[PDB]
Design a binder for these strands. Structure first.
Ligand SMILES: [Mg+2]
Lengths: 111, 32, 35, 191, 292, 130, 53
RNA sequence: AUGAGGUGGCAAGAAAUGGGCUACAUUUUCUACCCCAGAAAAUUUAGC
């Protein structure tokens, strides 16, 4: 999908209240998302089948990522623990991970 | 006559504990 | 700083435009759609 | 290994599966929900691996059954509105002063919102023990804070950092305003 | 490609999921319906996507999964249709039936279906010339004294159309406390917004924001704009109007008032007069606004 | 659980203090979100919960706003609103209801709750100073 | 936070510093972002600055 | 000495062309009102 379907067919990956009228810290949330996407893609190399989904409820930061089934499950658990703890101590908030493994990348069409 | 009722105070986690006490364990799932 | 303010008395996303576009165009900036 | 929805009975207790807000798990949701614009001679994408269904802020953890069970257990925490106050008409009678205060729910690491310190006190001047001179003096002291149509005086306090301090300041302002309206200075003689 | 077993499994899964959703939402599974499915899936999975297709949907499997697996012969290999070897058995069978009907007859608002609709109904691709030929045969059948059966056969091939005069909304007539009948309406012109009330009986008094019109509108052009609706239908001095306008300038306000008052006056005139007012351009909102 | 059930449950402690509680005339809850369906589901949830908690609630929809800006590439923000006005609820009922509906506040939905407390005149204002 | 004129006692009581500092403390009393301690330290800095001058 | 100082000087002139800023009025200007009053005095360049 092209960008002009962001509110028609595509959704939003990151979800937070910052950008709303009156709400503040949209830039801070943007920087948080940028660092967080970089770190997830650097900590699970070749595992992420699809982009993340960064949801926020108060302090909570739910990283709903979609990964593959190529790497061993013990390494998934080790990395999940590591990344949660490091991100919680980096953002000073209760970060959490919700991996969804898929047998392979879910193709939609071909371009 | 306006009878103002008395404040009910509950510890910081009462509502969460009540909500949890509403919900039973899931039999068909592995532990959380 | 404060000293400078005192003597004076005595007298949206913080990203580059393109980096905004990539995040905005990929749906990575919440609520920012294209008209 | 096979998804656990095959083991879920058709009369199982749903709230136990999703006690709280949780992401979409196609291996846990026993529904054949499909989401997506189909391709030519195609179908909306299945749930397994569907990013779009995972991007929705789902309400699976809040179902009518779950909501009723939760509200049945939360009834213990509630008091009762004094039955004497049947409507507004007695409500501005017995309790004239109305203090409006705002709270904000955002999402982020910091709870501080600078707009929560504002406090708005509203009182109808007819409820204040004022004579003609005192009412005149009060009205033309306050100026635009008093609305002639509604007989309501509105003091908005936001000077202090906290909200308790602004509430105290509003009460103090009203106090001094009453006392200085009920006082006749020397210049008051030459109306 | 989807096998029949796949669709069967999807049907069973859909039934189980329907019962699961009914259990989730607290309704009885037996009476749980597809509209209930749509409402429940919308609630549980909220979606603001404009494309209704893009929004999450739970449907009966066959409604999505298409099928065009028409087998034309059996195990022995004998085709089912006697016109099979033409390659266009459906089209030529239809032509044969039409020719037979024409032979029988000789012994004794709407449009023609488009080419693609005939394709869809026949489930066969056809060129343009053969569609012309079929339409010529249909017209020939129409010309002859076609009977009720032949009229129905033709009506199978003629679609419908609509008009744009019944879509004109005539507001209802209300009654005030005094028992006077009236009708209310709204109009818009640029940033000006007008809300008008037209009384059935009156003396030609128009009150704009509580002010007489000749005082509210010094410029003769605006007074002519206000005059146009009643003069067109010859009801000057027969109605009282009370209108409230806000925003815009003098001319935008006059145009908005004219539109609102015409839309209110539509209630007290004949349908012919409503159509004439529409054709005069009186009941149409002007979409011309300042551009960026 | 079909046989294996908890025998007894430790209910949370709710002590009836001796102080008088705050009284609220009105409690207006303005929720702002980027999606209308999310706000509709939240409206359903909040209204239902208010009904089983006995609180009188009315719902209306303040007009939406759009912020357009350009970098030409023209981007848009839509803010949709839902206003839940609760009436005639005490301090504790309001407190518990607000805790519940704020813990169940979905993604991208910010909340503005205005509480209209009821108070009596200070004793300094019942009579003038002599 | 509202009545900070008791920190102006050591300053001129009727000259133009009284004007300047009374208006300064009027400004400080309308500041919701500062605590009392910072306001007092700021008033003390003006105390110093005028005393060297 | 590409460091730190001091003593004097330096503060331009002329065109042809390119661009830019101001005032340019009687269908105008000043006052009251926001429109029924009183006093003044040739090439081009875009655009639908
Ligand atoms: Mg020089």
């Amino acid at each position: 999908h092209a960008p002009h379907y962001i509110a028609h067919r595509k959704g939003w990956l990151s979800l937070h209240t910052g950008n709303l009228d009156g709400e503040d810290h949209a830039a801070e949330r943007t920087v948080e998302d940028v660092f967080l996407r970089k770190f997830m893609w650097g900590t699970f190399p070749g595992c992420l089948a699809d982009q993340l989904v960064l949801k926020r409820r108060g302090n909570q930061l739910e990283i709903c990522a979609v990964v593959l089934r190529q790497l061993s499950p013990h390494k998934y658990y080790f990395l999940v623990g590591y990344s949660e703890t490091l991100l919680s101590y980096f953002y000073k908030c209760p970060v959490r991970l919700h991996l969804q493994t898929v047998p392979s990348k879910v193709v939609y069409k071909y371009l | 006559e306006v009878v103002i009722p008395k404040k009910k105070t509950w510890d910081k986690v009462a509502v969460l504990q009540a909500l949890a006490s509403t919900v039973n364990r899931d039999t068909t799932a592995v532990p959380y | 700083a404060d000293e400078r303010l005192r003597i004076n008395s005595l007298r949206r996303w913080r990203l580059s435009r393109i980096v905004f576009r990539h995040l905005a165009d990929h749906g990575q900036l919440s609520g920012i759609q294209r008209a | 290994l096979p998804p656990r929805t095959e083991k879920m009975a058709v009369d199982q207790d749903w709230p136990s599966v999703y006690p709280v807000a949780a992401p979409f798990k196609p291996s846990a949701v026993p529904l054949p929900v499909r989401m997506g614009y189909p391709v030519k001679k195609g179908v909306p994408m299945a749930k397994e691996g569907n990013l779009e269904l995972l991007k929705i802020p789902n309400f699976l953890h809040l179902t009518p059954v779950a909501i009723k069970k939760h509200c049945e257990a939360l009834k213990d925490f509630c008091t009762e509105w004094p039955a004497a106050l049947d409507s507004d008409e007695k409500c501005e009678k017995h309790f004239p002063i109305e203090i409006d205060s705002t709270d904000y729910v955002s999402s982020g690491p910091s709870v501080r919102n600078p707009r929560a310190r504002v406090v708005v006190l509203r009182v109808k001047l007819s409820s204040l023990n004022l004579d003609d001179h005192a009412k005149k003096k009060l009205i033309k002291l306050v100026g635009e804070r008093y609305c002639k149509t509604t007989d309501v005086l509105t003091i908005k306090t936001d000077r202090c950092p906290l909200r308790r301090q602004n509430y105290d300041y509003a009460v103090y302002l009203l106090t001094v305003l009453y006392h200085e309206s009920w006082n006749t200075e020397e210049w008051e003689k030459s109306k | 490609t989807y096998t029949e077993d796949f669709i069967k499994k999807q049907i069973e899964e859909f039934n189980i999921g329907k019962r699961h959703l009914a259990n989730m939402m607290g309704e009885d599974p037996e009476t749980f319906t597809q509209e209930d499915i749509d409402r429940a899936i919308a609630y549980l999975f909220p979606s603001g996507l404009f494309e209704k297709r893009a929004r999450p949907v739970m449907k009966h499997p066959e409604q999505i999964f298409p099928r065009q697996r028409a087998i034309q012969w059996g195990e022995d290999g004998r085709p089912f249709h006697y016109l099979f070897y033409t390659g266009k058995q459906s089209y030529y069978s239809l032509m044969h039936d039409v020719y037979g009907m024409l032979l029988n007859l000789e012994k004794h608002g709407s449009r023609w279906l488009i080419k693609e609709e005939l394709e869809e109904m026949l489930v066969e691709k056809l060129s343009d010339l053969d569609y012309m030929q079929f339409i010529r045969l249909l017209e020939k059948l129409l010309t002859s004294q076609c009977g009720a059966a032949e009229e129905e056969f033709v009506q199978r091939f003629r679609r419908s159309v609509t008009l744009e005069s019944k879509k004109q909304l005539i507001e209802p007539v209300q009654y005030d406390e005094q028992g006077m009948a009236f009708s209310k309406s709204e109009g818009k012109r640029k940033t000006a917004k007008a809300e008008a009330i037209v009384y059935k009986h009156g003396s030609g008094r128009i009150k704009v924001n509580g002010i007489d019109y000749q005082l509210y509108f010094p410029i003769t052009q605006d007074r002519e704009q206000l005059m146009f609706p009643f003069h067109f239908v010859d009801r000057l001095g027969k109605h009282d109007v009370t209108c409230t306008v806000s925003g815009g300038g003098r001319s935008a306000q006059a145009g908005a008032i004219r539109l609102a008052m015409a839309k209110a006056l539509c209630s007290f005139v004949t349908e012919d007069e409503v159509e004439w007012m529409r054709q005069a351009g009186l009941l149409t909102t002007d979409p011309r606004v300042r551009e960026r | 659980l079909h046989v294996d059930v908890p025998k007894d449950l430790t209910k949370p402690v709710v002590t009836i203090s001796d102080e008088p509680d705050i009284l609220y005339k009105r409690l207006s809850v303005l929720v702002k979100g980027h999606d209308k369906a999310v706000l509709d589901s939240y409206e359903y949830f909040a209204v239902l919960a208010a009904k089983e908690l006995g609180i009188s609630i009315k719902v209306h929809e303040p007009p939406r706003k759009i912020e357009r800006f350009t970098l030409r590439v023209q981007y848009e923000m839509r803010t949709l609103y839902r206003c839940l006005e609760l009436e005639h609820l005490t301090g504790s009922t309001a407190d518990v209801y607000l805790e519940y509906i704020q813990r169940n506040l979905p993604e991208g939905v910010a909340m503005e709750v205005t509480k209209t407390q009821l108070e009596q005149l200070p004793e300094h204002i019942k009579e003038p100073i002599w | 936070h509202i009545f900070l004129e008791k920190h102006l006692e050591s300053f001129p009581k009727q000259g133009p510093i009284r004007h300047f500092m009374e208006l300064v403390t009027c400004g400080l009393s309308k500041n919701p972002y500062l605590s009392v301690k910072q306001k007092v330290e700021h008033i003390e800095w003006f105390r110093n600055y005028f005393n060297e001058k």
